[PDB]
């Protein structure tokens, strides 16, 4: 046997263990302890946990029923024009026995990728045989999924995680797990997570397999993020109006080979927790704005970048 | 047919003015040999009427007969655009403009459709196919880098007359290859023959002083000044020299805006006039154009120490309009800055 | 100070002299959504309008330059005075006016038709509202033409569309 | 036996001790070589650094010669690389044995920051399902080409540029294999404009000996390009020191004979307004107006133009760097 | 018999014709002697005759027989992405050189890129030749020509040797256009080629293109100076004086005249900005002045290339230099 890495070892299986978005959780965890559970879509970011909260929800709903009342399909399935009518169908169709206020549950994991041609011929066997199975299906862009199968369903929007919903995961995770850890390692593991929990968990298993002690240099060092000390650092050096120290950053910053646009990423997330006026934070990020416009259109260098730190400077002296 | 349409001139000799530029491109395109052209000036100078001279003189009498047609195509997104162009057997019109950010496309695909397709007739049609890409400053500078190399490939094949009025939106690339003609807007006395002419066409009698002042009140636009002197026509046919010239609804709301901003300046007034703009706004007035009128009004008023500023700002605010995508917004802060600045002029 | 105006003996050195000839040296070392659907409405407006025209008179003039310069003045144009006397009693020069305005609506292709009111009378109105994009709501009104003078052009533009019809039947 | 090749191939880092500069990512790849537990690896960084290097010496050194083609799945950009070769060649690979030897297996997909979207989506089931059978080391330039679910999937390396504390050797050895003389004058000229990295001084020294034979900072600079500081120091002396018409005309003068560009004139000169010590409003004025010229210069504007405009950001300062004394 | 564009017929066909361009001139007919030929890196003022030449070369070194299977000609006329350099550059540097001259003249063992027109690559574009470069420099060559040498990067010029590109004299590029049309049968003087040789600024490919488009122009009859104003666009220079005369003045009234006569004359902005940079770097305004006009100038040349009104740029512009040419009035 082979240890699994942590995205896939600590998912949950009860949904109690799931975080973020509690009101959802906890609507989802009165239909799975009650039952009658109504077509289901669930959108949002991706790592959120649209998958996981659909499989525990057919796990608590089904029990022992799971291979015969569940359906499961993905992406790397077909699901086209001969899927919907030869597959869905005969399993909407399909004598399952079950408890009462419990369901068939046919799981379309990823239907961005499905074609509109398999969603219209998807809508007469999910209103006809509602009364048997229901639909639960996951996808990124809601936009994808075409009008007369969001109506439907009553669709859920899943939010991006916060910090508190990431470090309570990662609490139980390193308890689990009897990591030792500092708060500075913590704070930079969600800083490089940005919301998501399977990026924060990856970088959680490379910080403890390189070095195993977790500290912001450490994380910094396996992650090889732009380390955003020094983006603080010419920042605050931007609004000292200090072009020389900034630009030594910059230089510092260049050296290593870093691009463009993610050092200007870098420096639109450190300038939107800044610390300073009001004002000059919109001024700030107007001008950051501005200038991540040319280099989104193409051109970047040092000489722009420069600029930026020029108009930056600028700003303070502009009353 | 009005005042502006059943009297355009058909030849380049016919025209009422720039003779000597209309022999120039008499000579020119009488060898055979001619360049991509690209036509430019004000607007209502005369540049359609000269690029239709053009082609009158390249071709038979076939060229006014023009039809319209619908073309599909499709996105690099799949999302089908309609674009209406208007067509001959001799040349072919296209408004990219109207594909909006799409227009590359119409220049990567639709060009390549009048590029690689040979003409069907030798003899009664030349060796050549023109191409009006018309309004040219209006294109994205991706199309005109994608207009480079289908204007330059295909030069045995395909000629381009781009019609515009700032070759400075087109990019020096296109203009290096392509031969710059330019067309002059015709003067006072010029539009003051015109209308004339026009008149002793139709048997009219127009006083000088009342042609003078057509003339000066289109600001050297001879469309516009040719609408508004039939507009005096129907509107009192026995013409005196203080006659009310029809002023449009649109110079009307912009003189009403410049003595709003004159009479009282406070933030309510600044909505009812935020009111007036989105009306021309939703006219579907061009916000150049607004610009320009609003100038032309507002510096009427000004002082002389205070002109200079304001066309600046007013010159900064379009620049600003163009590279932006609202125009309100703009609009509102153009407003704005110019209601501080007389605020702060008429309270020192 | 970073110029210096004695010159470094052991850094390098970059010149600089201004105008005068000076020399020193450096160290080298609900309003928007409703006015959005007005703003889409009207331009919905003008592609139906543009689409109506002729070709001939379509390459002539651009979309904005025929809703800058020629559509108020054209509707000066097709609103003229006109009494109202029928057809047989009017003059020769009467008669080559409305054959001229006839012309000019239909090579705008702008047709009268009847439509309804809540209060209970008919009212004559063009197919394209033309009316909504010239006319000001602050601007100084202006007398419409009548009921019988509308009524008597949408009759003439039907009888000479029925004129063109049997002229392309008779040089066909 | 000696081979006509280039000199980036022909001294070629074959074993991981030959690696000069990142010495810790070594290190840990060879703890994980020597008991087995090799991940899923991501390598970026700047180009030339020995990425590629790196995975083919791990590769040579893990799979012997006799079993190399039947354990190392190589695909590169000029290869087919579409969503039928993720269906085909790789998952064939990845989902079945070996047929001589058993043991696992490595797929190296070079220059895959150009690969299309539904690949990188697809490869990702191929990679977690897989993992006992294969590892995949993505090697890419930037990032953000690839979707964050490959960036959490494999590791992440970022080999960094090598630093001029620790070239020098490996220039030294390269001039010693191939008797070549050099000056220290010559060493500093490779160590600070030859891009930072080792994978182009060997190539610089190799198109210096095909030249001329002898390699001076004199006979590289008009071999190579990338004008003199001489030069540079010319083109900033006409626009600080000499009226606004003779300068434009020398500084055009130098442009319509040599052949320079405004743009690394422009370049070459922000290099160098850091190194002139101007003063802080001054050389904050110049960056500004600089980058001005230089998105100025990325549309379609008059070259002329934006020389005169140049020109006159330091004519602007003449005055004030005057006046300040 | 057909009147060819006439900027192709006086090309030269051997490398012996090039003239003032002595030390390329030795060193690629040492490489038709068959001499080793290095990578080329050809940069220089435009117009001064990078194109022919080695073009000359590639027909002396193979002739019309073996131009189309050796030669790769590569120029901003056709789209050059990652992928293209990619794929066709490596696969045709991958190509065996097969085939021999019929008449009896040497083939060189090498094919020839000519990389023209090389500042429209990216980065990434130069570093993808690399490899392609230096791998297949035993079957394939490279030449990369630019007008601007520095935009290649240090590894890609790192990758060539150079070869400084000499500018023309003004006398001897006279001739050229003088032969041209004297041979073409058409009529110049003297004042209206010198002033042509001075509007083209030593684009000599320029000067020829405006001298047969303006032989299109009058059609056969004489080419007079206000002709060679209108084929490059020029604004006669009392015109622009009329602008320097208006914003002495003081007066933005005569100010507005002038730039709504401008603006009514159909004057492109672009070629206004470029008359009054000229104009204003050969007059005699003081150092703040001439810069703060340039700089406007260089501001209103990024806002009409945004797109811009050229009404608005253009008061604005004159607004600012008649602030300028009364502020010490
Ligand atoms: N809210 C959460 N609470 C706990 N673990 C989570 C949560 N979200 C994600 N995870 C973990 O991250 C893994 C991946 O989450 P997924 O559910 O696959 O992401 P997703 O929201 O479904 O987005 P996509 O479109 O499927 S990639 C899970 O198996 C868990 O181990
Ligand atoms: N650490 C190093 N020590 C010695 N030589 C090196 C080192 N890194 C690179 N080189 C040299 O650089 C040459 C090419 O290196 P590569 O690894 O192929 O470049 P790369 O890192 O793959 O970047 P790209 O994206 O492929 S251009 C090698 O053949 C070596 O000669
Ligand atoms: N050295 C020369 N000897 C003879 N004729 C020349 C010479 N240089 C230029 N010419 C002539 O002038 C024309 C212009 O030369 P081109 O090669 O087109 O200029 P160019 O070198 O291409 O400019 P760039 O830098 O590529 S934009 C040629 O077609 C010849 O007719
Ligand atoms: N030479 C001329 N003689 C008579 N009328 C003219 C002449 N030139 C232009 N016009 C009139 O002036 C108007 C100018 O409009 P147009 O030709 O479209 O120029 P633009 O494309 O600049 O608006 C036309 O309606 C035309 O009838
Ligand atoms: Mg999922
Ligand atoms: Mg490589
Ligand atoms: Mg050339």
């Given at each position: ?28 965890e ?50 086209g024009?001969?899927?919907v009518?030869?597959?869905?169908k005969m399993?909407?169709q399909?004598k ?17 990728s ?12 999910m209103?006809?045989?509602?009364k ?8 990124n ?7 007369p199968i ?16 990431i470090?309570t ?11 030792p ?5 913590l704070?930079?593991?969600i800083?490089?997570?940005?919301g998501d ?12 397999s390189?070095?195993g002690?977790?500290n912001s240099?450490?994380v ?8 955003p ?15 020389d ?7 510092h ?10 050092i ?17 934070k ?11 416009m040319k ?10 970048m ?14 | ?37 690209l ?12 690029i239709?001279?053009?082609?009158r ?6 060229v ?13 997104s799949?999302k089908k ?11 072919l ?11 590359r ?12 397709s040979?003409?069907?007739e ?6 050549f196919?023109?191409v ?40 020096p ?14 003067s ?13 066409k139709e ?13 000066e009140?289109?600001?050297?636009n ?70 320009k009128?609003?100038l ?53 | 100070?970073?110029?210096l ?31 959005q659907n ?18 001939a ?34 003059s ?7 054959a ?28 394209p509202?033309?009316?909504?994009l ?30 063109r019809?049997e ?6 | 036996?000696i ?5 980036v ?5 074959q ?31 700047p ?7 790196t ?18 799945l ?9 969503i ?9 690979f ?7 030897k058993?043991?696992f ?9 150009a690969?299309t ?29 690839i ?32 008797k ?34 002898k ?53 070459e ?11 802080s ?8 107006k600089?980058?001005d010229?230089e ?20 004519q602007?300062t ?5 006046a300040?004394? | ?17 090039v003239?003032f ?6 060193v ?9 030929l290095?990578?080329?890196?050809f ?14 070369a ?30 066709k ?25 000519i990389?023209?027109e ?8 130069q570093?993808a ?21 520095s ?22 590029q006279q001739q ?14 003297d ?34 100076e206000?002709?060679?104003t ?7 220079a ?9 914003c ?6 005569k100010?507005e ?6 603006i ?23 150092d703040?002045?001439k810069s703060?006009?340039?700089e ?9 290339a ?24």
């Amino acid at each position: 046997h082979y240890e699994l890495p942590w995205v896939e070892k600590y998912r949950p299986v009860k949904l109690n263990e799931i975080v973020g978005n509690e009101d959802t959780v906890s609507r989802l965890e009165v239909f799975a302890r009650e039952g009658n559970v109504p077509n289901i879509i669930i959108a949002g970011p991706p790592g959120t946990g649209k998958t996981t909260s659909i499989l525990c929800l057919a796990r608590a709903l089904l029990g022992p029923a799971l291979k015969d009342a569940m359906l499961e399909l993905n992406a790397s399935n077909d699901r086209g024009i001969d899927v919907v009518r030869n597959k869905i169908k005969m399993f909407a169709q399909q004598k399952v026995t079950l408890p009462k206020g419990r369901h068939k549950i046919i799981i379309l994991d990823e239907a961005d990728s499905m074609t509109d041609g398999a969603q219209q011929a998807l809508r007469r066997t999910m209103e006809i045989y509602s009364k048997t199975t229901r639909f639960a299906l996951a996808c990124n862009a809601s936009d994808k999924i075409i009008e007369p199968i969001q109506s439907r369903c009553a669709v859920l929007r899943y939010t991006k995680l916060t910090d508190a919903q990431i470090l309570t995961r990662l609490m139980n995770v390193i308890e689990k797990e009897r990591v030792p850890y500092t708060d500075d390692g913590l704070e930079a593991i969600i800083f490089t997570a940005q919301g998501d929990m399977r990026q924060a968990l990856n970088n959680l298993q490379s910080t403890f397999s390189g070095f195993g002690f977790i500290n912001s240099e450490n994380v910094f060092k396996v992650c090889d993020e732009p380390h955003p000390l020094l983006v603080k650092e010419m920042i605050q050096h931007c609004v000292n109006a200090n072009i020389d120290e900034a630009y030594k950053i910059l230089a510092h910053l260049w050296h290593l080979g870093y691009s463009p646009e993610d050092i200007i990423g870098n420096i639109f997330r450190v300038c939107k927790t800044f610390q300073m006026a009001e004002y000059l934070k919109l001024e700030f990020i107007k001008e950051i704005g501005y200038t991540h416009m040319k280099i989104a259109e193409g051109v970047n260098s040092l000489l722009q970048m420069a600029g930026l730190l020029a108009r930056l400077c600028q700003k303070t002296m502009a009353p | 047919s009005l005042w502006v349409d059943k009297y355009r001139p058909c030849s380049l000799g016919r025209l009422d003015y720039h003779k000597e530029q209309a022999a120039q491109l008499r000579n020119l395109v009488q060898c055979g040999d001619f360049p991509h052209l690209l036509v430019y000036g004000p607007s209502g100078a005369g540049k359609k009427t000269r690029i239709m001279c053009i082609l009158r003189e390249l071709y038979g009498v076939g060229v006014e007969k023009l039809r319209i047609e619908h073309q599909t195509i499709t996105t690099p997104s799949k999302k089908k655009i309609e674009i209406s162009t208007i067509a001959s057997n001799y040349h072919l019109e296209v408004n990219p403009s109207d594909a909006g950010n799409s227009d590359r496309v119409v220049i990567q695909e639709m060009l390549k459709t009048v590029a690689q397709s040979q003409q069907l007739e030798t003899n009664s049609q030349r060796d050549f196919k023109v191409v009006l890409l018309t309004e040219v400053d209006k294109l994205t500078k991706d199309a005109q880098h994608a207009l480079r190399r289908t204007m330059e490939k295909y030069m045995s094949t395909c000629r381009l007359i781009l019609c515009c009025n700032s070759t400075s939106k087109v990019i020096p690339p296109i203009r290096s290859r392509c031969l710059a003609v330019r067309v002059p807007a015709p003067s006072i006395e010029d539009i003051c023959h015109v209308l004339s002419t026009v008149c002793k066409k139709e048997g009219l009698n127009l006083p000088s002083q009342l042609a003078h002042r057509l003339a000066e009140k289109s600001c050297r636009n001879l469309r516009k000044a040719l609408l508004m002197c039939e507009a005096c026509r129907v509107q009192q046919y026995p013409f005196t020299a203080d006659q009310e010239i029809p002023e449009t609804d649109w110079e009307v709301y912009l003189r009403e805006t410049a003595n709003a901003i004159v009479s009282q300046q406070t933030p309510q007034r600044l909505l009812e006039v935020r009111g007036r703009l989105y009306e021309l706004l939703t006219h579907c007035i061009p916000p150049e154009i607004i610009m320009k009128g609003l100038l032309s009004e507002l510096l009427h008023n000004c002082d002389g120490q205070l002109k200079g500023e304001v066309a600046q700002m007013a010159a900064y605010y379009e620049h600003r309009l163009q590279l932006g995508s609202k125009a309100i917004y703009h609009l509102e802060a153009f407003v704005a800055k110019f209601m501080a600045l007389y605020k702060k002029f008429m309270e020192d | 100070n970073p110029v210096l105006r004695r010159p470094p003996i052991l850094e390098d050195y970059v010149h600089v002299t201004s105008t005068e000839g000076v020399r020193a040296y450096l160290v080298l070392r609900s309003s928007q959504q409703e006015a959005q659907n007005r703003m889409s409405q009207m331009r919905n407006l003008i592609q139906t309008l543009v689409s109506g025209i002729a070709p001939a008179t379509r390459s002539r003039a651009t979309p904005q330059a025929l809703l800058l310069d020629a559509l108020c003045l054209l509707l000066d144009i097709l609103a003229p005075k006109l009494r109202p006397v029928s057809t047989q009693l009017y003059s020769t020069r009467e008669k080559q006016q409305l054959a001229s305005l006839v012309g000019t609506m239909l090579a705008y292709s702008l047709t009268y038709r009847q439509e309804r009111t809540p209060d209970g009378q008919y009212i004559y109105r063009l197919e394209p509202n033309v009316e909504e994009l010239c006319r000001f709501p602050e601007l100084p009104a202006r007398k419409p033409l009548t009921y019988q003078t509308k009524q008597l052009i949408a009759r003439e533009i039907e009888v000479e569309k029925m004129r063109r019809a049997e002229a392309s039947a008779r040089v066909e | 036996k000696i081979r006509n090749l280039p000199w980036v191939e022909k001294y070629r880092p074959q074993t991981l001790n030959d690696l000069i500069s990142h010495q810790d990512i070594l290190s840990t790849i060879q703890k994980f070589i020597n008991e087995d537990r090799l991940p899923h690896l991501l390598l970026y960084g700047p180009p030339g650094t020995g990425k590629t290097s790196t995975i083919l010496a791990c590769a040579k050194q893990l799979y012997k010669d006799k079993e190399f083609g039947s354990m190392v799945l190589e695909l590169n950009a000029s290869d087919d690389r579409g969503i039928d070769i993720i269906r085909g060649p790789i998952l064939s690979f990845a989902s079945t044995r070996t047929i001589f030897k058993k043991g696992f297996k490595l797929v190296i997909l070079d220059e895959a920051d150009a690969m299309t979207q539904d690949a990188q989506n697809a490869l990702r089931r191929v990679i977690e399902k897989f993992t006992e059978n294969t590892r995949f080391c993505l090697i890419c330039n930037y990032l953000s080409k690839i979707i964050p679910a490959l960036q959490s999937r494999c590791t992440r390396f970022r080999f960094g540029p090598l630093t001029p504390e620790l070239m020098v050797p490996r220039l030294e050895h390269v001039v010693e294999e191939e008797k070549v003389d050099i000056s220290e004058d010559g060493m500093k000229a490779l160590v600070t404009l030859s891009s930072g990295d080792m994978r182009r001084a060997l190539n610089i020294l190799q198109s210096t000996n095909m030249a001329f034979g002898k390699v001076t900072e004199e006979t590289v600079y008009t071999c190579t390009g990338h004008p003199l500081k001489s030069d540079i120091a010319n083109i900033l002396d006409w626009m600080l020191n000499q009226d606004f018409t003779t300068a434009y005309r020398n500084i055009t003068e130098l442009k319509t004979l040599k052949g320079l560009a405004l743009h690394d004139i422009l370049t070459e000169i922000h290099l160098f307004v850091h190194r002139v010590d101007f003063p802080s409003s001054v050389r904050i004025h110049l960056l500004t107006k600089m980058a001005d010229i230089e998105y100025r210069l990325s549309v379609g504007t008059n070259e002329k133009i934006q020389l005169s405009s140049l020109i006159a950001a330091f004519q602007v300062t003449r005055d004030l760097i005057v006046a300040e004394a | 018999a057909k009147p060819v564009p006439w900027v192709e017929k006086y090309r030269p066909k051997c490398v012996d014709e090039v003239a003032f361009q002595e030390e390329v001139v030795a060193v690629l007919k040492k490489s038709l002697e068959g001499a080793d030929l290095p990578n080329l890196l050809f940069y220089g003022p435009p117009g001064t005759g990078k194109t022919s030449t080695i073009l000359a070369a590639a027909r002396e070194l193979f002739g019309p027989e073996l131009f189309r299977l050796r030669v790769l000609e590569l120029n901003a006329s056709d789209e050059r992405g990652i992928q293209v350099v990619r794929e066709k550059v490596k696969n045709f540097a991958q190509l065996t050189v097969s085939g021999s001259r019929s008449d009896g003249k040497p083939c060189p063992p090498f094919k020839i890129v000519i990389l023209d027109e090389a500042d429209s690559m990216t980065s990434a574009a130069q570093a993808a030749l690399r490899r392609t470069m230096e791998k297949e420099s035993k079957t394939t060559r490279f030449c990369l020509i630019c007008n601007y040498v520095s935009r290649i990067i240090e590894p890609l010029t790192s990758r060539c040797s150079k070869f400084r590109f000499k500018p023309l004299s003004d006398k001897i590029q006279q001739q050229r256009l003088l032969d041209i049309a004297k041979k073409e049968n058409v009529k110049i003087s003297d004042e209206g080629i010198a002033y042509l040789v001075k509007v083209s600024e030593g684009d000599l490919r320029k000067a020829i293109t405006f001298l047969q488009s303006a032989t299109r122009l009058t059609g056969g009859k004489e080419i007079t100076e206000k002709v060679i104003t209108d084929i490059a666009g020029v604004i006669p220079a009392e015109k622009i004086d009329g602008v320097f005369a208006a914003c002495q003045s003081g007066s933005f009234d005569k100010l507005e005249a002038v730039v709504k006569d401008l603006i009514d004359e159909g004057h492109a902005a672009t070629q206004l900005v470029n008359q009054l940079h000229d104009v204003v770097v050969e007059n005699n305004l003081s150092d703040k002045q001439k810069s703060i006009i340039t700089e406007k100038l260089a501001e209103v040349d990024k806002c009409l290339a945004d797109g811009a009104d050229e009404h608005l740029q253009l008061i604005s512009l004159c607004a600012t230099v008649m602030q300028q040419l009364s502020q010490n009035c």
